[PDB]
Design a protein around this ligand. Structure first.
Ligand code: ATP
Lengths: 481, 51, 502, 245, 72, 247, 72
């Protein structure tokens, strides 16, 4: 905006207090780049944003890169607006840090259009009324624990359980079935896992290394190398990069914000750096306000839905402490990926029983969907109970009114496993997208009692229920030989 | 067999009650941990300034 | 202070041009140190403690704590666009809010500013934020029943006009559709609801306001709504403007029903608004002032005596035990400030009882004095049966027994507990819930298929009022459950049992 | 607190009367001190209160002393915050009071009103000289039974009630009878729920507790003693319970 | 009673008197300890002495430590 | 503490003799640092100690080293604040202390003195090539038996002593025998015990533990292994107790 | 020991060196890595490293977060 030259008066660690002339002052969250000088002899400029004003023309600003090598008196330049993120169709495929410069070294991104990070909330008239189910394309999620378009979603399962193949399936199925694109928003992502995910994408056809601007992901990687002001604002960077998609192409967007507890952790880091007196257990006082400012722009505006999918990592495994409390106050569907199920090979490893959603209620899903979902959850409850007893009594000794329950429970537990459009690189199965109606009718046929004769391994890794009958009929053809 | 089934139902209600007790103890332990940590942090910050 | 807020070079220049010279600045002040939502203004010596000072952009601020030089204000709108050196001006009014009878139906953004976007509201301001709470001589004991609609609530934990009654659940279990049900059942009787959502995701308050839209409660309700994406000062003052707006109708002789949503979230926003000030906190880092906060707020909701006109305001706040512990600081604090608790257990809602009310813990201190003269005896009998079932299920009678229940009392208690469950936002009238209570408690139907007592009683309620409008008349006019009404409802339920048999 | 206390002490010191002051929520006084001293610039103290949390409330309590002219029996409904007795605001009141009765929320969650926890409830007047060896001995015996019950509650945990031997089973039956009997329909709790109130005297309840601890009342079930007055009325309630089956 | 001093300080004493009560007692007993009579001082609520010392030291604005108790 | 260190450092730098400094309550060397650091202007650290807890504690502990002119063996009686074994004051001294020995109030409330924990007390001199192979094996077996007892403390306390196995019951009785046999009548603790003290060497306690946990003498009563110098004195006390039982 | 740089920080070594030691070993192993050799840097007591950072920051008067560990 202006040559608002000030001097970087105080630099405590990452936080750098800059002064300004008494005329013009950058307001809160108004990004400012300092014309820094590195030790090597190149004028690298580390960007900052005004987290706080301290009155005597000195705005306390946190840095988006290392402050090792910032003399006091360096020229700090105001931009007049928050951090300009290079939104658009251009930022579809490349990796980004928080300030919006591609680090995957492919090339520069078209900054012809850019939106500020800290755009305010949508409005009451702009929010949408109908609690609309979001057809993911996973049979487990679509049947048992539906996702709310415009809502929030929690992937409680850690890494190694199959979270990466699940999110890759979700992105590819968004690009295939729906009309929109996704935005992976890895906040504080461990760089090894970052490159793991990027290579998994590039080898799974999710983003094309030969064809950018035709791909289906806007990677925003805030590596944990970066200062706390950076990996805190990476969530909001991904958020505005997806909000441009929403309010410019009217398409369904997916935010795969990586585990929110890192965002709240970075907020605690930056608040302890600013000296603002800490709150309960040790997260920032503006914890509810900050995490709500991150997760309230996830709303289905009349233009299009911006539904997000946010991993959540409870520290010491309690729903009680404020950060998981203030997060679960916002989540609208919580699906846990279970490690034992993943080791079994019921991919996707999403646990059918412990996963729940606020959308599951009948007025939201459909009366038949609520009935069949509650009946499947009761059946899987019965099987989790009788897993104790089928070891002692056997499948034959116990009563044959619930031997049917155990049989249909094996059938459901297998039928929930779906081959993915991403697992083709590993195993070779083609991959089937299963609509909500198809899985509803399939589970109704499985649980009603028709398919009590098909074998248990005919439901494993299959799409629609008629395809499961096709698998069983092929097994019947080969039974003679 | 009757004694073994009585021992089975004793162990069964004991396992259910131990599950309930583990849940209640985990809740009390989380509230104790949060209270301890927040008391520690208020101690530290309030002793920091000492005007 | 060594670094005083009145030490900016420009500011001390203003004082150093004249030491003991021409008369000072009356009402013009330059904002400085506009940081954590708390702008420290220099000057403004005419500001009343609690003034409503305006800024350059147009963001209103309360001047709470004004020191020797700096009048530190608490700006309501986010202090983002406010730059240091901007000129502010006091308005000459003490925390005043525009309020009128035109707000009925609107969606206010906690500053008496509409956020629905359809037009702006006019008023005569006439109401204060920090109002004098109703005195001791002005409050008359709560007797007027308040038809919450839910069988469990208005049967065992009754709420009366002017008796505050919190809804202390857990996260994602009731209290929002439950409070919406209580607002929604108020269609026929005249109340001016105020559903003030302190902290709610904007999609949730959009869903609630549209529920009100299509179901007709907007003719009287007033959604003073504040999203979770709002500065903590606005989430702090949202229930205060909600309460002043409901008091404008309470003081004019008209019954009201205000419902705070996430009153724990107002305490959380006050925790933010104070720990940014670095005022010393207490237990769970709350600044200790949360009790005074929820006293000014909840204590200005009680029934006024006939001296000031028969007005009333139940308060129905909603604290969320996110900790899962009722003995946390702000839940026990609001329980100590309120007149009773309606506990919405998480385990029962996960089990299936859709109004998650557990009857043992949830008590209403106003008691049977609140209920109608009709329901007192029959709800006493139902509470007796619920005590019986609670003991029979919580304790022995697992082995068959010397007692041998499920033949005498456990079946009937299970019928009661499976009868208490409602549909989603399907309010029940007074006479209908009277008959629903009576059917189960005095043993009109015991041996039915326990899974579908609701599925029977939907047909029962559909048939009885269209068959015997005498019952609705005896309950609506006399308000008392006479024994001739018992006879005629016996005939009606006989005919309903017949048509259910066939 | 100070102004009501001055209003009472004027009567106790000038008119020589046995005035009572039912000061309600002492904790609210201490918490108001917490607010004012967080705003008065006084340095913060234990968890949140004023530094003078043991001299300001000392100025409250120590002015309530029975002088040689008149006596005052204040009943201070001091409030433990967040339901823990280790807190300083009631911990500094425990040292000043002499007949502290802790209304623990446990017995109210069980439905036993009043929820006066018999183990925590204690008085400096439970002495031989004051109440006589009769009432003192029965108080000691009932506190013995209740303490044994509370210490084997760790076994009425994970295991079941059956695992106790006959000794612990009998003492648990007696302790349940007692902790049920310690309930009473108040004369002011006619409003909430239950019977009209029953005034129970000392020389009358001593008979009930002697009878329960003497073992001569093993025949009665548990819900017979609950919410009843005298022991004869408890036996009457048991008989009517058997008639109504 | 002929041999027992009772250095008694009420709750409504200013917190310096509560802090100096055990010291007055210790000095008055140490006079007899130097007069070779085997005395016996008995404190009562020695938590109250450190509590009143905390009140003073926090009212003096000396920095506190654990449990908001002052340093020494 | 620095004065003691200066005397010992002189006797190790100049007099060329191996010295044995006993510091009692080294935790005072940190707590007094706390009480002065509060006033000094240094910011408070964790639970209430000084900021430079670790560097000050190291400034004391590092000067105690065998330095080719002698050997300063030292036994600091570290004070665990209310048995907060995670507190900063013992947590920083565990890093410096080679042959740590955690004494437990849990094993003192039942009267087993010294209250040294068999499990927690560990030393980096329990490596086999340093301490002797048979001694190392006996130490491993004793620690494993005590660990099995500490893991069966939950089953014993709740479900009764009988509800476990009959080999595991032998391990429980053997762990009782061991954890009582490692009691000692000190010469200076005779005023607390009332019984005279017995100084017992290393090889004698190894030969005792071998016969105790080899199952050869699992018949003696548990009290016959309590507060006893050597295994032969335990055998004699078994005879004394069997005579006193009938007499 | 032919191929092992044991960067050693004794206790009485000041706070800054116990702070800087992981970075020193990292700068050695980073050279050995950038010159094609696989390496293996094994730190010791990162709790002690963060304790030394706690020391130097709290001395430098930087605001403390949880457990009194500093901002960053
Ligand atoms: N009686 C009921 N029967 C069936 N479903 C219900 C009922 N009440 C509420 N719900 C479901 O609960 C959802 C609303 O959440 P609920 O009111 O239970 O908690 P909440 O107050 O919104 O949670 P929070 O306190 O975090 O805002 C709705 O989607 C609705 O489907």
């Amino acid at each position: 905006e202006k040559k608002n030259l000030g001097r970087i008066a105080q630099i405590i660690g990452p936080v750098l207090d800059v002064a300004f002339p008494p005329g013009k002052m950058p307001n809160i969250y108004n990004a400012l780049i300092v014309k820094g000088r590195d030790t090597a002899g190149q004028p690298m400029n580390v960007t900052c944003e005004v987290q706080q004003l301290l009155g005597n023309n000195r705005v306390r600003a946190v840095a988006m890169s290392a402050t090792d090598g910032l003399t006091r008196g360096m020229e700090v330049i105001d931009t007049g607006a928050p951090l300009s993120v290079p939104v658009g169709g251009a930022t579809l495929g490349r990796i980004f840090n928080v300030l919006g410069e591609p680090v995957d070294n492919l090339g520069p991104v078209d900054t012809r259009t850019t939106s500020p990070i800290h755009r305010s909330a949508p409005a009451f008239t702009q929010l949408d009324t109908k609690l609309s189910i979001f057809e993911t394309g996973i049979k487990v999620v679509d049947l048992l624990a539906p996702y709310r378009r415009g809502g929030k979603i929690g992937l409680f399962g850690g890494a190694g359980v199959g979270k990466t193949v699940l999110i890759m399936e979700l992105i590819n199925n968004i690009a295939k079935a729906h009309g929109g694109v996704s935005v992976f928003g890895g906040v504080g992502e461990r760089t090894r896992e970052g490159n793991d995910l990027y290579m998994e994408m590039k080898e799974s056809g999710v983003i094309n290394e030969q064809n950018i601007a035709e791909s289906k992901v806007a990677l925003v990687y805030g590596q944990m190398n970066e200062p706390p002001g950076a990996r805190m604002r990476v969530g909001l960077t991904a958020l505005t990069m997806a909000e441009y998609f929403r309010d410019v192409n009217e398409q369904d967007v997916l935010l795969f914000i990586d585990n929110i507890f890192r965002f709240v952790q970075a907020g605690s880091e930056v608040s302890a750096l600013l000296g603002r007196m800490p709150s309960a257990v040790g997260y920032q006082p503006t914890l509810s306000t900050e995490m709500g400012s991150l997760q309230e722009r996830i709303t289905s505006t009349k233009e299009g839905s911006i539904t997000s999918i946010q991993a959540v990592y409870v520290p010491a495994d309690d729903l009680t402490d404020p950060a998981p409390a203030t997060t679960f106050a916002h989540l609208d569907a919580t699906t846990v990926l279970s490690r034992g199920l993943a080791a079994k090979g019921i991919y996707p490893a999403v646990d059918p029983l412990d996963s729940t959603s606020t959308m599951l209620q009948p007025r939201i899903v459909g009366e038949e969907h609520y009935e069949i979902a509650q009946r499947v959850k009761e059946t899987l409850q019965r099987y989790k109970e009788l897993q104790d007893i089928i070891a002692i009594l056997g499948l034959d000794e116990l009563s044959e009114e619930d031997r049917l329950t155990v049989a249909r429970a094996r059938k459901i537990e297998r039928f929930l496993s779906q081959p993915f459009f991403v697992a083709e690189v590993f195993t070779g199965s083609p991959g089937k997208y299963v609509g909500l109606a198809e899985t509803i009718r399939g589970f109704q046929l499985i649980l009603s009692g028709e398919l009590d004769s098909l074998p248990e391994q005919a439901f494993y890794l299959v799409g629609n229920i008629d395809e499961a009958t096709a698998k069983a009929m092929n097994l019947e053809m080969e039974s003679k030989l | 067999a009757s004694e073994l089934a009585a021992r089975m139902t004793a162990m069964s209600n004991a396992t259910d009650n131990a599950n309930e007790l583990k849940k209640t103890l985990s809740i009390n332990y989380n509230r104790a941990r949060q209270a301890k940590i927040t008391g520690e942090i208020l101690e530290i910050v309030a002793g920091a300034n000492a005007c | 202070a060594t670094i005083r807020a009145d030490e900016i070079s420009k500011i001390i220049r203003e004082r150093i041009e004249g030491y003991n010279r021409e008369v000072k600045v009356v009402n013009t002040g330059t904002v400085l140190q506009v940081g954590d939502g708390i702008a420290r203004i220099h000057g403004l010596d005419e500001v009343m403690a609690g003034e409503l000072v305006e800024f350059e952009e147009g963001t209103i601020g309360i001047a709470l704590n004004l020191e020797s030089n700096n009048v530190g204000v608490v700006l309501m709108g986010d202090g983002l666009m406010i730059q240091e050196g901007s000129s502010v001006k006091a308005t000459g009014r003490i925390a005043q809010i525009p309020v009128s009878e035109a707000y009925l139906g609107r969606v206010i953004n906690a500053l008496a500013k509409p956020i629905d976007g359809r037009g702006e509201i006019t008023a005569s301001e006439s109401r204060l934020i920090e109002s004098p709470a109703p005195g001791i001589m002005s409050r008359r004991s709560v007797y007027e029943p308040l038809q919450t609609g839910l069988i469990a609530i208005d049967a065992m934990i009754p709420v009366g006009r002017g008796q505050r009654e919190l809804i202390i659940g857990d996260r994602q279990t009731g209290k929002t559709a439950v409070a919406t049900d209580t607002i929604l059942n108020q269609q026929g009787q005249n109340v001016i609801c105020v559903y003030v959502a302190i902290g709610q995701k904007a999609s949730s308050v959009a869903q609630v306001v549209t529920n009100f839209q299509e179901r007709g409660a907007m003719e009287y309700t007033i959604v003073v709504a504040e999203t979770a994406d709002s500065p903590a000062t606005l989430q702090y003052l949202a229930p205060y403007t909600g309460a002043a707006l409901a008091e404008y109708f309470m003081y004019r002789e008209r019954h009201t029903l205000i419902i705070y949503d996430d009153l724990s979230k107002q305490a959380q926003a006050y925790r933010q608004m104070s720990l940014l000030l670095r005022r010393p906190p207490g237990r769970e880092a709350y600044p200790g002032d949360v009790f005074y906060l929820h006293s000014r707020l909840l204590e200005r909701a009680a029934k006024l005596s006939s001296l000031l006109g028969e007005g009333s305001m139940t308060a129905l706040p909603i604290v969320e035990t996110q900790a899962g512990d009722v003995s946390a600081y702000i839940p026990t604090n609001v329980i100590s400030i309120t007149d009773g608790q309606i506990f919405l257990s998480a385990d029962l809602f996960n089990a299936g009882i859709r109004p998650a009310i557990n009857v043992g813990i949830s008590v209403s201190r106003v008691g049977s004095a609140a209920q109608i003269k009709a329901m007192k005896k029959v709800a006493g009998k139902l509470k007796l049966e619920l005590a019986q079932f609670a003991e029979l299920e919580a304790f022995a009678q697992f082995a068959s027994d010397l007692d041998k229940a499920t033949q005498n009392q456990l079946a009937r208690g299970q019928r009661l507990r499976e009868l208490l469950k409602q549909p989603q936002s399907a309010p029940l009238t007074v006479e209908e819930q009277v008959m629903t209570i009576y059917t189960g408690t005095n043993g009109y139907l015991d041996s039915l298929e326990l899974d579908q007592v609701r599925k029977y009683l939907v047909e029962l309620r559909t048939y009885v009022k269209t068959n015997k409008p005498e019952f609705q008349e005896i309950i609506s006019s006399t308000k008392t459950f006479t024994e001739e009404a018992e006879a005629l409802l016996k005939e009606a339920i006989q005919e309903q049992m017949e048509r259910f048999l066939l």
